[PDB]
Amino acid sequence: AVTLPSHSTRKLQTRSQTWLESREYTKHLIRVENWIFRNPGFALAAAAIAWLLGSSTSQKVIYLVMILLIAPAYS
Amino acid sequence: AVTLPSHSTRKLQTRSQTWLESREYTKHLIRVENWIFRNPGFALAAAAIAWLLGSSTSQKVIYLVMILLIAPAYS
Amino acid sequence: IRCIGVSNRDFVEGMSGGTWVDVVLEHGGCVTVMAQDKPTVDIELVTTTVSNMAEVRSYCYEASISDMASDSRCPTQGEAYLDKQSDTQYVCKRTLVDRGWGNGCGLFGKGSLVTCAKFACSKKMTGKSIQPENLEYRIMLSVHGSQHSGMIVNDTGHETDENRAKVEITPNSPRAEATLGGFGSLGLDCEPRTGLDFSDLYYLTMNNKHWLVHKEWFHDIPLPWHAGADTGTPHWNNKEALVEFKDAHAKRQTVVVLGSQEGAVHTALAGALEAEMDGAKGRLSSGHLKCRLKMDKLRLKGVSYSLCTAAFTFTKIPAETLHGTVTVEVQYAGTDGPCKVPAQMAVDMQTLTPVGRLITANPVITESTENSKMMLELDPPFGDSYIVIGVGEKKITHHWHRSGSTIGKAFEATVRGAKRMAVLGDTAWDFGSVGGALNSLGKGIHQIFGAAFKSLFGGMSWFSQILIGTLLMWLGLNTKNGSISLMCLALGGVLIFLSTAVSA
Amino acid sequence: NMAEVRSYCYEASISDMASDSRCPTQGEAYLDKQSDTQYVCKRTLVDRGWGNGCGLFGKGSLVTCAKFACSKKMTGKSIQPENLEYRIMLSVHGSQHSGMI
Amino acid sequence: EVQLVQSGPDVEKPGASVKVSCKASGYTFTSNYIHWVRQAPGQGLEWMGVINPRGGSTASAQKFQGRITMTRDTSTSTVYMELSSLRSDDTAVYYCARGGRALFYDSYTTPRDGGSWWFDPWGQGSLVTVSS
Amino acid sequence: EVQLVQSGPDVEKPGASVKVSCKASGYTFTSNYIHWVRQAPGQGLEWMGVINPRGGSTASAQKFQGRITMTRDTSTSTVYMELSSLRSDDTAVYYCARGGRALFYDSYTTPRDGGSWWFDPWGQGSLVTVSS
Amino acid sequence: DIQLTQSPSSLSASVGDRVTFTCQASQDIRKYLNWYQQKPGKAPKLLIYDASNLKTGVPSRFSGSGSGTDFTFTISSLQPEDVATYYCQQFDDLPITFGQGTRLQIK
Amino acid sequence: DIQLTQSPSSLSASVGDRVTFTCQASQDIRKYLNWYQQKPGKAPKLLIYDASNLKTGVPSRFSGSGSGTDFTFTISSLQPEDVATYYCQQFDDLPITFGQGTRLQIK
Numbered sequence A, B: 001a002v003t004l005p006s007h008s009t010r011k012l013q014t015r016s017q018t019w020l021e022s023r024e025y026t027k028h029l030i031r032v033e034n035w036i037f038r039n040p041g042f043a044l045a046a047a048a049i050a051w052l053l054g055s056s057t058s059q060k061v062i063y064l065v066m067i068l069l070i071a072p073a074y075s
Numbered sequence C: 001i002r003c004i005g006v007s008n009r010d011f012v013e014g015m016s017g018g019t020w021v022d023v024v025l026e027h028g029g030c031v032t033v034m035a036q037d038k039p040t041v042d043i044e045l046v047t048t049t050v051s052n053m054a055e056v057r058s059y060c061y062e063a064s065i066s067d068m069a070s071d072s073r074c075p076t077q078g079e080a081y082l083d084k085q086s087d088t089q090y091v092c093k094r095t096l097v098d099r100g101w102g103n104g105c106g107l108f109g110k111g112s113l114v115t116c117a118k119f120a121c122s123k124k125m126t127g128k129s130i131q132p133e134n135l136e137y138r139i140m141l142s143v144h145g146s147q148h149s150g151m152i153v154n155d156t157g158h159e160t161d162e163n164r165a166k167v168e169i170t171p172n173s174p175r176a177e178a179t180l181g182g183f184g185s186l187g188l189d190c191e192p193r194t195g196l197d198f199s200d201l202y203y204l205t206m207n208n209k210h211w212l213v214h215k216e217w218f219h220d221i222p223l224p225w226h227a228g229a230d231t232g233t234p235h236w237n238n239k240e241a242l243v244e245f246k247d248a249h250a251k252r253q254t255v256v257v258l259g260s261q262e263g264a265v266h267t268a269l270a271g272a273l274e275a276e277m278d279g280a281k282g283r284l285s286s287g288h289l290k291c292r293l294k295m296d297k298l299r300l301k302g303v304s305y306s307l308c309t310a311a312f313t314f315t316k317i318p319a320e321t322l323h324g325t326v327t328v329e330v331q332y333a334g335t336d337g338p339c340k341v342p343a344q345m346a347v348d349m350q351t352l353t354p355v356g357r358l359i360t361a362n363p364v365i366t367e368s369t370e371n372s373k374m375m376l377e378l379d380p381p382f383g384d385s386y387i388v389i390g391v392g393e394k395k396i397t398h399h400w401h402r403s404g405s406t407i408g409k410a411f412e413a414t415v416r417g418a419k420r421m422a423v424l425g426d427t428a429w430d431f432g433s434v435g436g437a438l439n440s441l442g443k444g445i446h447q448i449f450g451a452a453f454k455s456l457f458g459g460m461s462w463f464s465q466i467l468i469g470t471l472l473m474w475l476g477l478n479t480k481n482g483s484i485s486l487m488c489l490a491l492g493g494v495l496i497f498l499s500t501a502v503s504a
Numbered sequence D: 001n002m003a004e005v006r007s008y009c010y011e012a013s014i015s016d017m018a019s020d021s022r023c024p025t026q027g028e029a030y031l032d033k034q035s036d037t038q039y040v041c042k043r044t045l046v047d048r049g050w051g052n053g054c055g056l057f058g059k060g061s062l063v064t065c066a067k068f069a070c071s072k073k074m075t076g077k078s079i080q081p082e083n084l085e086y087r088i089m090l091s092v093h094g095s096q097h098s099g100m101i
Numbered sequence E, F: 001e002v003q004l005v006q007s008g009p010d011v012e013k014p015g016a017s018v019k020v021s022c023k024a025s026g027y028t029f030t031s032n033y034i035h036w037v038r039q040a041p042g043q044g045l046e047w048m049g050v051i052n053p054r055g056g057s058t059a060s061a062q063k064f065q066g067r068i069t070m071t072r073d074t075s076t077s078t079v080y081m082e083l084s085s086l087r088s089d090d091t092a093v094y095y096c097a098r099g100g101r102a103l104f105y106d107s108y109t110t111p112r113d114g115g116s117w118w119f120d121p122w123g124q125g126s127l128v129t130v131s132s
Numbered sequence G, H: 001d002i003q004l005t006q007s008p009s010s011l012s013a014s015v016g017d018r019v020t021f022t023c024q025a026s027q028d029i030r031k032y033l034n035w036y037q038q039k040p041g042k043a044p045k046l047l048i049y050d051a052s053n054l055k056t057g058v059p060s061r062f063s064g065s066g067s068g069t070d071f072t073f074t075i076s077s078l079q080p081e082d083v084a085t086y087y088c089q090q091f092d093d094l095p096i097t098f099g100q101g102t103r104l105q106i107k
């Protein structure tokens, strides 16, 4: 029973304050930070991964974001 | 009340079958597919984005995965 | 009146000749229109209401299981039947299980059985639908001048009174001339359609808690469906994600229900807007719209009125608003009748040098009674002020000193306009509304461009749009041929400004 | 033997709510209710205007809160590698037609 | 019809606590500040305190600080007064009354008043006696 | 002539199921929503449910959810009502009636009604008693 | 869900009198209201559809009115065939309810 | 606070007489003054809000006036239902006090 649709993906950009934004516009940050605080070495894992893609010294951090941002949620 | 920790990020690789794997090893796929079926034009959005990064014709699809895989969950 | 201390208010004028003041009506703020004639007017959107909602598919998140069933079968005799499965009130799944010796089944190896149980449930999610028709807008508006302490508190008689008025708007009857006996007609005609982009919006009531949801999200939720249904035992649809089947290492499969996911749908509801009294009458909070407002017929009621020479006295310490203006409530007895009263300001007198923004034009007093309280406001220039009230020698004056610089005014105005530019998108245009060429040009350019921005960058989240803007910046420095890298800078800055939204 | 470490409550109930408004400038809300911990309270800056008391006006403050009664505790006990117990059964072949637990 | 009603007269122990109820009728219960006022049999009236039916806001005078508690009950539209640590002066009659523009949660008297300032539903009076 | 007719009165066991027939006359059977309405001997009328003679569409109220079934019979132009798990309140008289613009398959009441909304063929009333 | 009070509970009058019954519902029933009269052991009598409309064959002795939430039926002149229990009932939102009744008696 | 004297202490008059009560407070109470009359064992009688305003249902037999610090109530014509203890009380600054009383008697 995955209650899949996090409705924020269907925000109403309307003047009155929405349902639970108060914690929402921090919840994904606390998500990723909690997950990485629990799985630290995955940091240098992602590092060795990204440093091997892009080969730009500028897309490298982009693939770092890639990996560190697939890991938390879809896991 | 974000029940943040999807425990699969702390799997027990043990012989007996875990809690809800039956739907779990398909739930993220149905996640992304549902989300994109609801927000189609984001496809070519991600396309124009990625085709402008990497500049490899091989990292391009990698950034396509990047975008199409940040969009569903963290939204 | 009615729009003071309600910051996110605005003031809009109209270049006189052809009253054409199309305001962007706000259910989360007020808007005051002024004119050299035509007593200054306010408008504030009280509530938004929906009359008729249709009962589209419902959801169940609290289920219960009972009378379980397994129906084992030998490794080779077909696979399990379990006449229980015959009914749909039961949910069943078929699983290959180990079947050995000392287990019956003279053969052995992989056999099969169908575990299942009854699916009884509670706490339905009534996800009704609404349509752009038989919805209902309800606003109230108020002209300035009289009515000490306007103050919605006793609004009941104030719509019966002259200074306030209550207006209902339907997509069937868009026009409404807000008529104020002695004041005017306040012609209004709005767009009861393009307010909240309806027809993609569902009214979900779960635990007598209501809200609005983008129907796409509502279609995408994987819980059991009532699916359209009416009375009769609810034949729930998909019936599977809720319950969870589990066998032993090889054998003896059972089922768990996974309880209720009420808080789960809450945390998944991270974008909806809550809504209240629902009855057959469902009310909801803010939602904007487009209202063509015409000063066809507004008489100022007392331009001929004399300036009765009683001494006027402040009562409350006229503090100012974020919009820089300042409201004062001045009481006086001493004279009688439907008085006109002076109210100007200066930097020096022996001139009285009437300077500055006069908001509450033609301030009117009603009757002979004692120290009537005469609420009103004015707006001073960027420096020290001398607000002057009464008439001459037995007048009353007062320091202000706005302390808000002219370039500062442009700062506040442009950041306000930019926040409008963001949240109202296209509708932020025609806000200051004359039918000028470049106005329709801005409307159209935002129409096509921002519609493409929608369809391309579909519902980009907080974090998403954040990092997208960041990498667009990083690329806006990298690429050659500024023509397109400047377009990277442009879209990235658009995204980052969108992330500077009301959230802060 | 399992030891009774922290429990959890997921089914709560609220009652006897309380707001305790305060003027834009007189400090901020006290609400003697907040004194107790059986009540949960949070302090919020609210608008306070004219015709609202409070001869001043602007942003005032009040502390909304209510009693936190709850049910359906989650007994999350602890266990340790000692005073746990394994129990096996074993069987030699040969005799015993239809061994069969 | 706007009208208040008290509980019956009561007799208590010195040092005990007495709770008198006040039920409203004819109006929206969340729109009138409930004022409690004491009256000794031979003495005049002295205002005890005020509560708001909404949000359970409270205040009183120092003559009762530490003994008086005042609570709401939104369901049946009632307000409950407890006097604690009863004392020989407490033998009196107490009155509850609806009052003015009860907008949020307070006394709020710098703004206007009157129009039955607190005098439409003065009810019947709660006679309390404190002895053995 | 437009007219409905019920079956004879019947007596059943508590917890049994009773089926009452309703035959139509004088009109095209597929053009009138059949409404069933109960009436206890001393009580008033309370609408039970509705069926469409065409397509066998059905609906009712929660006072009968899980016990009431309503079926069509296009041949003889009849509608059959079953009450299941009979209960002491069921001793009543039930009425069947033709209704309004039965276009497809529903109640369909946001559009118009009346003109014998459901009142031309109220038939005769089916008396049912539930006991031993 | 559509509580509808039908006043009075009972009445008794002489022949040739006008009588009126009221029914107010807690809901908005703009025009979806209807009126019957039934004897014991009878199918009810053709009275009123849409709370304002006489049916064919009904005597003009009866009339119905009312717009928003409360509605008035009226017998112009009482007659011996008017002994019955009168009922008013709404048509909308479909928990269809009726009134408990208004009973008559000749003097 | 707020010390408010209510004069006289008592009075007694015949039916049909005018009577006036004074109350002066030590403070400025511009218009926040009110007036009651109460029997023993009664809820008091609707007299006066804002020291100048008659309430609905109150007989015009009563009137109230006064602006700055001292205020006058008046019964135009005495009547048997006027036996009570009359009270004046302020509304401002919130140590709300009342007068000790003005008592009546018919002759």
Ligand SMILES: *[C@@H]1O[C@H](CO)[C@@H](O)[C@H](O)[C@H]1NC(C)=O
Binding pocket: C147, C148, C149, C150, C151, C152, C153, C154, C155, C157, D051
């Ligand atoms: C209160 O109501 C009166 C009418 O009874 C009206 O004159 C006055 O303006 C109202 N005051 C407020 C603050 O609404």
